From a paper:
The best-characterised SAAT, [name] (Ag43), is a protein that contributes to cell aggregation and biofilm formation in commensal [name] K-12 as well as in major pathotypes including enterohemorrhagic [name] (EHEC) and uropathogenic [name] (UPEC). Ag43 possesses a modular domain organisation that is common throughout the ATs, which encompasses an N-terminal signal sequence that directs the secretion of the protein across the inner membrane, a passenger (α) domain that is responsible for the function of the protein, and a C-terminal translocator (β) domain that facilitates the translocation of the functional α-domain to the cell surface. After translocation, the Ag43 α-domain (α43) is cleaved but remains attached to the cell via non-covalent interactions. Similar to α43a 13, the α-domain of all three Ag43 variants folds into an L-shaped right-handed three-stranded β-helix, with each turn of the β-spine comprising three β-strands linked by loop regions.
The α43_[name] and α43_EDL933 structures in this work correspond to the uncleaved α-domains. To investigate whether this mechanism of self-association is conserved in Ag43UTI89, which imparts a reduced aggregation phenotype, we first examined its oligomerisation in the crystal lattice. Generation of crystallographically related molecules of α43_[name] (i.e. symmetrically related molecules in the crystal lattice) revealed a head-to-tail dimer repeated along the crystal, which resembled the α43a–α43a functional dimer. It appears that the inability of α43_[name] to form a double interface may be due to the presence of long sidechains on residues such as R161 or D133 in the F2–F3 loops mapping in the lower part of the β-helix, which in a head-to-tail association via a double interface would result in steric clashes between interacting proteins, although we cannot rule out other amino acids that might also interfere with this interaction.
Numbering used by the authors: 2 to 434, 452 to 561
Write the structure that this text describes.
């Protein structure tokens, strides 16, 4: 009928048209399709199923427009709630599936086993508790998307939450999440307190004024401490990542072997790593270890001491920053420019960058490492390996042995003079970041490397140039030319042609020192590469 009295059970039935069911006994298998037609929090709403103290409902279905209300001492199990349906909970609910529906847990209510799908929403108010929730919605679009009132919003207490792909738990400023696992594609944003989070691929964002305690960051998990956030007792395991932004704090960190730290000297990070204790405080970094994935930014006016950059780690030093007693393990990335001050050891030996004098010596740039030589600066005895980049601004200089392995890059942004030997297995390129430039070197040892040069075939006989100053060009160097003129305009060369390699002051070049890596053509002309008796190399027209 309309009232289910104590000690009485009722089976089946559908509520429509603002009809009411007041449950004092047990109501099994009801379908609730009325009571929410004017949306949540509307006086005009009427009807629904209302579980009283000592009442029970089992296997209730709450369709669009349906309202289930559960008073204190009322109890429901095995509910499912569609889009446009809702359950208001001060009693206890066990196993509620929200397929678009909403569950409001009021002060004193306990929601256990709620499954949040398809842009449903569990709202855990102050004084309320959620337990064993499964979140499958709310993070759609990714961490920078905002889906509002979807997923789980925690103003009270959330316990033993599972955040799956596309799931989002928002811990409001007064809320508390006490045991949480986050999988890949899910995230937990913390304005309040997060306790015992495990990030098994998932992300945790600690916002300003939020705190996270005893976070375990496993493979592919990402804990981000934003400005004014606090992490305490984070453990970063293999392939996990702790990032502490400027003005963020993380204390009692434990970085295992393989656990990345991503921070700067503007942040506060204290803990231990594979070598012992470390600190990042007051613009100073002591003892930092950068695992595979890790990065330490030493900002201008800041300093780091006793840093180990291990395979896959990154030390980045701004102009005016200082990093001493640096150990670059093979594979470690060093990012700096002539303005920085760095000293330590890498795989090939001792290295240093003097920011005042503008001189670098013994650099090893690999695996994302990179160095820029500014005007009036010098890089001496640089080794550029796989995924390393050496960039020279106009007015920057090279000396000693500049060695480019395969997969290495040197970018020349103006005229550049090497007072030593360039040993090139990699790619050298002339660039502007059209005015041609000169690469002058004392000796060039070609090991199958390539030099990317520009040329204009429109009659101006202009191109980039290589100058051998008194030594020799030996081995094998490929020259890759790009016509930066019109592609159908070819003007014949004159005399010896366009001098692309100039041997001067007695320099020689071996007979096979250079060869075009691909044809060079414009208009009616093919342009061949030719060595002449003056040891110089020329582009000349034919056809």
């Amino acid at each position: 009928d309309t009232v289910v009295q104590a000690g009485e059970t009722v089976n089946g039935g559908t509520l429509t048209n603002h009809d009411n069911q007041i449950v004092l006994g047990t109501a099994n298998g009801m379908t609730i399709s009325t009571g929410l037609e004017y949306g949540p929090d509307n006086e005009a709403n009427t009807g629904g199923q209302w579980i009283q103290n000592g009442g029970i409902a089992n296997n209730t279905t709450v369709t669009g427009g349906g309202l289930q209300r559960v008073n204190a001492g009322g109890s429901v199990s095995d509910t499912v709630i569609s889009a446009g349906g809702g359950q208001s909970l001060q009693g206890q609910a066990v196993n509620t599936t929200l397929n678009g529906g909403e569950q409001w847990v009021h002060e004193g209510g306990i929601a256990t086993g709620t499954v949040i799908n398809e842009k449903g929403w569990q709202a855990v108010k102050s004084g309320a508790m959620a337990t064993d929730t499964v979140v499958n919605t709310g993070a759609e679009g990714g961490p920078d998307a905002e889906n509002g009132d979807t997923g789980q919003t925690v103003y009270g207490d959330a316990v033993r939450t599972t955040i799956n792909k596309n799931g989002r738990q928002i811990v409001a400023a007064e809320g508390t999440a006490n045991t949480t696992v986050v999988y890949a594609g899910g995230d937990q944003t913390v304005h309040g307190h997060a306790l015992d989070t495990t990030l098994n691929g998932g992300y945790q964002y600690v916002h300003n004024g939020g705190t996270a305690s005893d976070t375990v960051v496993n493979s592919d998990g990402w804990q981000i401490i934003k400005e004014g956030g606090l992490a305490d007792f984070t453990t970063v395991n293999q392939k996990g990542k702790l990032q502490v932004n400027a003005g963020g704090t993380a204390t009692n960190v434990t970085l295992t072997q393989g656990g990345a730290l991503v921070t700067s000297t503007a942040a506060t990070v204290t803990g231990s790593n594979r070598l012992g204790n470390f600190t990042v405080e007051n613009g100073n970094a002591d003892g930092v270890v950068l695992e595979s994935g890790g990065r330490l930014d030493v900002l201008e006016g800041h300093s780091a001491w006793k840093t180990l950059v291990d395979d896959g780690g990154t030390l980045a030093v701004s102009a005016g920053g200082k990093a001493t007693d640096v150990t670059m393990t093979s594979g470690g990335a060093l990012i700096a420019d002539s303005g920085a001050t760095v000293e330590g050891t890498n795989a090939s030996g001792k290295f240093s960058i003097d920011g005042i004098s503008g001189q670098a010596s013994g650099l090893l740039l690999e695996n994302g490492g990179s160095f820029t030589v500014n005007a009036g600066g010098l890089a001496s005895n640089t080794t550029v390996g796989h995924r390393g980049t050496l960039t020279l601004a106009a007015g920057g200089s090279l000396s000693g042995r500049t060695q480019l392995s395969k997969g290495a890059s040197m970018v020349l942004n103006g005229d550049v003079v090497s007072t030593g030997d360039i040993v090139n297995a990699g790619e050298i390129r002339f660039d502007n970041q059209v005015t041609f430039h000169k690469l002058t070197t004392s000796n060039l040892t070609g090991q199958g490397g390539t030099i990317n040069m520009r040329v204009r075939l429109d009659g101006s006989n202009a191109s980039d140039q290589l100058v051998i100053n008194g030594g020799q060009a030996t081995g094998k160097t490929w020259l890759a030319f790009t016509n930066v003129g019109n592609s159908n305009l070819g003007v014949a060369t004159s005399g010896q042609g366009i001098r692309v390699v100039d041997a001067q002051n007695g320099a020689t070049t071996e007979e096979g020192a250079f060869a075009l890596s691909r044809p060079l053509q414009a208009g009616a002309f093919n342009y061949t590469l030719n060595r002449d008796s003056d040891e110089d190399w020329y582009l000349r027209s034919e056809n």
